[PDB]
Amino acid sequence: LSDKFSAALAKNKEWAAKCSQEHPELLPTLAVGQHPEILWIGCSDSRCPETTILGLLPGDVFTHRNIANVIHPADLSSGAVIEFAVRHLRVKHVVICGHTKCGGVAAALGNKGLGILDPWLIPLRQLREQHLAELQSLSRDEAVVRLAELNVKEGLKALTQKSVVLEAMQERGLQVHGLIYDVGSGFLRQLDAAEPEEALKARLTSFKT
Amino acid sequence: DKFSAALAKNKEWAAKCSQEHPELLPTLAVGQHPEILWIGCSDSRCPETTILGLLPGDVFTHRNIANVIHPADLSSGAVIEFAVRHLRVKHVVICGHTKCGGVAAALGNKGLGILDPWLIPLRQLREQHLAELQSLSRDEAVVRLAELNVKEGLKALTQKSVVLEAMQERGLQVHGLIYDVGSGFLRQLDAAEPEEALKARLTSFKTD
Amino acid sequence: LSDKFSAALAKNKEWAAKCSQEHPELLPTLAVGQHPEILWIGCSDSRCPETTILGLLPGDVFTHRNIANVIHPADLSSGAVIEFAVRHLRVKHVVICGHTKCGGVAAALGNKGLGILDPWLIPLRQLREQHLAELQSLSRDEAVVRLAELNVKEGLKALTQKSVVLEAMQERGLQVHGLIYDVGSGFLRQLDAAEPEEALKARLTSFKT
Amino acid sequence: DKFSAALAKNKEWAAKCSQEHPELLPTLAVGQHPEILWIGCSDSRCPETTILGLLPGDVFTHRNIANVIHPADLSSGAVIEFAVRHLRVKHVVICGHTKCGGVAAALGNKGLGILDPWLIPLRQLREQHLAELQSLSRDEAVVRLAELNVKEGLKALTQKSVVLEAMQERGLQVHGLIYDVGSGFLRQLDAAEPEEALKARLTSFKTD
Ligand SMILES: [Zn+2]
Ligand SMILES: [Zn+2]
Ligand SMILES: [Zn+2]
Ligand SMILES: [Zn+2]
Numbered sequence: 001l002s003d004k005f006s007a008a009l010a011k012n013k014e015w016a017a018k019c020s021q022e023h024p025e026l027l028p029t030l031a032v033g034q035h036p037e038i039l040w041i042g043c044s045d046s047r048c049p050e051t052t053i054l055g056l057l058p059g060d061v062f063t064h065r066n067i068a069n070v071i072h073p074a075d076l077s078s079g080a081v082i083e084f085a086v087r088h089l090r091v092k093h094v095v096i097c098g099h100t101k102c103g104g105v106a107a108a109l110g111n112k113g114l115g116i117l118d119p120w121l122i123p124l125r126q127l128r129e130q131h132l133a134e135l136q137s138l139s140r141d142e143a144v145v146r147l148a149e150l151n152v153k154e155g156l157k158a159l160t161q162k163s164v165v166l167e168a169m170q171e172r173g174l175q176v177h178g179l180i181y182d183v184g185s186g187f188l189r190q191l192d193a194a195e196p197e198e199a200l201k202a203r204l205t206s207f208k209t
Numbered sequence: 210d211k212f213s214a215a216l217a218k219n220k221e222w223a224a225k226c227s228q229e230h231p232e233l234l235p236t237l238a239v240g241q242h243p244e245i246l247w248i249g250c251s252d253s254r255c256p257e258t259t260i261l262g263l264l265p266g267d268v269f270t271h272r273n274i275a276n277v278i279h280p281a282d283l284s285s286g287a288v289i290e291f292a293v294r295h296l297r298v299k300h301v302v303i304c305g306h307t308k309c310g311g312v313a314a315a316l317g318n319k320g321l322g323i324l325d326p327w328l329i330p331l332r333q334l335r336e337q338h339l340a341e342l343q344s345l346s347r348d349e350a351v352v353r354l355a356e357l358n359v360k361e362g363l364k365a366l367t368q369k370s371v372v373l374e375a376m377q378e379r380g381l382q383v384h385g386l387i388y389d390v391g392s393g394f395l396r397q398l399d400a401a402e403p404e405e406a407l408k409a410r411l412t413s414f415k416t417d
Numbered sequence: 418l419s420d421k422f423s424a425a426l427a428k429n430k431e432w433a434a435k436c437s438q439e440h441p442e443l444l445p446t447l448a449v450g451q452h453p454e455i456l457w458i459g460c461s462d463s464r465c466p467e468t469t470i471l472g473l474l475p476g477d478v479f480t481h482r483n484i485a486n487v488i489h490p491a492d493l494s495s496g497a498v499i500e501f502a503v504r505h506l507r508v509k510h511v512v513i514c515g516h517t518k519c520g521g522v523a524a525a526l527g528n529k530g531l532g533i534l535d536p537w538l539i540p541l542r543q544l545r546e547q548h549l550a551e552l553q554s555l556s557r558d559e560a561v562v563r564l565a566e567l568n569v570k571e572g573l574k575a576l577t578q579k580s581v582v583l584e585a586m587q588e589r590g591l592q593v594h595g596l597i598y599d600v601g602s603g604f605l606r607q608l609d610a611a612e613p614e615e616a617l618k619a620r621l622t623s624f625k626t
Numbered sequence: 627d628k629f630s631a632a633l634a635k636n637k638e639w640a641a642k643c644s645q646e647h648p649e650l651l652p653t654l655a656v657g658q659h660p661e662i663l664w665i666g667c668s669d670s671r672c673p674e675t676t677i678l679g680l681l682p683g684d685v686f687t688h689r690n691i692a693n694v695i696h697p698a699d700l701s702s703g704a705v706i707e708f709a710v711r712h713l714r715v716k717h718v719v720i721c722g723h724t725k726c727g728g729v730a731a732a733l734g735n736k737g738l739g740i741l742d743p744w745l746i747p748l749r750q751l752r753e754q755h756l757a758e759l760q761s762l763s764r765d766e767a768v769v770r771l772a773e774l775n776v777k778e779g780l781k782a783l784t785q786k787s788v789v790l791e792a793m794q795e796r797g798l799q800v801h802g803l804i805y806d807v808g809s810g811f812l813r814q815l816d817a818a819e820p821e822e823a824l825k826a827r828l829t830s831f832k833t834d
Contacts, residue, residue, distance in 0.1 A: 463683050
């Protein structure tokens, strides 16, 4: 039965042939330089390929995907992506997308040791501690969704606790957005993700350099 | 507004998926079973699922600046642990690309703030291969250092007990590619190491 | 003659001579194996050498020192020290020691960009944002002290959001302590670092493996 | 017991310091001017200020498991930036030591949880030098890998623009030591590199 790696390289050649036949200017024009307007921070989960689920093309979405779309404030991996997207490509939108049935969110609600995943998941366990009574009042499936939403909202806070982001929000109206992707339906939903404007004033004072 | 345009295109895409693959999304909701972990660049021109002609559920994905594997990076570390031990992917692919902004940054000497520590592995390869890279044009050096970065990434990937375990226990394979953003073609890298190399790595890294 | 490095190697040999003369069994007995009962997490600040300011000897204090004694939850540097000290050496005490006139705490209350220090100092700026009204109500010098104390208390919280620490606290009565070192007087003062008992219960539920 | 005993000994030490160095604490109350950055092991037997016969204010200090320099580690990165750029230390010392638990862990094949990613650089040196280390006794291998770790750390330390700038601008020096926990003596390591090596590093790492 088929080697999925070999099958993928053959499907890549078919995709390159389709590009050459249907849109022969697209890839050569993108090779001159990318100009995406969107930074996507989402989960590595194979069911959440940003460009496919958004109905977009190569060149549209600058992408970071990690376990459970977690923003550790001092993580160089997300830190370097955000610096490059915001300062160098000047994206207009930063999207943090969580998803239903997230294995990283579910791991954080369990109490099994998962080796190197344990430090990675600490931010999710911090949210679990802070919201423990609320999460215990929900079904397992509702708790995984609620913690996924709380994680997206906390990530948007962490994202704005960066001078490069606050500068872009003041200079060009950079927007930040929280989404949940429903792996069962294919639909994205927006999170309210409200903060008092008081919140951003304190953050500006505390973080702009 | 590209954000509101993308949400409208998402709804259209999800509706079309329900009509043209009616079993896909409901079966994916039960559980993912991807056979491939892709480690690639965040570059907007390298969306793994589209360039491979695949579907949602096929590729477990990590994308960062210049597809760099720092040995002790928890972000790539956690992805590799989850993909290899929990999802049991059969393939790990590191994919570099032509016209990589991270590779180009590393060949320059401009300070880029938080990017500077991130790009150290590329500058280590630049130092190690300095005569070879200086013998090339800037455009040729950006390709060459992209290739050297993929090959070094495959070494870093295999200096992990979780990977070495899966290679011996269940035949996990690792692969290096370069994506040409101008042609849409993936090229396989030779990425040769003597078998002697994996023996010393097993001794040095595999834990009980 | 002015070279502090060569002067330090000469003073090292004088110190080795003093050990051989005054306590000839000490270093050979320590060479058999270390048994410190204290893990110290302090600032790199040259004024805070733990073994000297505690009046202790080599072998007494397992030590981590970093900029402003910051505990990033997912930092492998502090993570590995804590794992080794708590699980393998079985220390009885973990001390987080902040200090007066901390340059890292002062940096976090300023708005100058300090390159690679910026991500490192984010937890201090998070405390600044959370306590902004309180810190703005104080003099510059009082704010530097207050933020230094808030940083030690936040570090003790981060330290207990680790299964290895919670396990040792329950199984063998490991204790954790917050101190401030006054660089001008040489005195250590203890911080209260009391938590509502609800807090510790939720942390056990949320973090113990 | 030992915690309350240490607080009482602290007060006695501060009282004795006021009598035997009456200018020291009042000068330190206002600031610090150490000329040395020490990067050493957390090992309780390697307290830098004590083994150097120095005082508070003399040694800006970073201690971690096995004195490992991960190139992109923000913990060591932030210390080096602060010491070199802001305090303008004249010397950076990396000190390894005999009977190092982290070095010994890297030569074993037991899984140690969060220590495993931390110890990768030691296992990379073990792989690179495997034949040489297998030719030695356990005790000789622990010393040899400790020395290889100090030398690799000095390379990582100099692959930083802040260090290279200080070396060129103000003659910052870097030094590798091994501390013998049994004798109390520091030994200097030869730590030779072709001058060719530092030139390629300057080209590859110094920001304009
Ligand atoms: Zn997920
Ligand atoms: Zn790239
Ligand atoms: Zn300090
Ligand atoms: Zn050691």
